[PDB]
Design a protein around this ligand. Structure first.
Ligand code: NA
Length: 98
């Protein structure tokens, strides 16, 4: 009913952040969303990031209205320590293989 914001700093590993991203202002989501947190990646080991979280900002760069490609460029260009500001909607983010 009320969602919640957090800011966390993730130190990258060999595989980077360890996540995949979907969405963008150019999409049905209208936001940059974390689709998956990969096992054994940096974001998993940190424990705090969840699929479905929205990336609002990265190291002082606003991604609230970014297109998918704008966001990837931003994320690609980040340093070793990535300060992410996230919004967690109460909605679940569901993913099923069949
Ligand atoms: Na966003």
């Amino acid at each position: 009913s009320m969602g919640c914001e957090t800011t966390i700093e993730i130190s990258k590993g060999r595989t980077g952040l360890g996540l995949s991203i979907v969405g963008g202002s150019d999409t049905l989501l209208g936001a940059i969303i974390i689709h998956e947190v990969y096992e054994e990646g940096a974001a998993c080991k940190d424990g705090r990031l969840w699929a479905g979280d929205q990336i609002l900002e990265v190291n002082g760069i606003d991604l609230r209205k970014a297109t998918h490609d704008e966001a990837i460029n931003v994320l690609r260009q980040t340093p070793q320590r990535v300060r992410l500001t996230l919004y967690r909607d109460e909605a679940p983010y569901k993913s099923t293989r069949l």
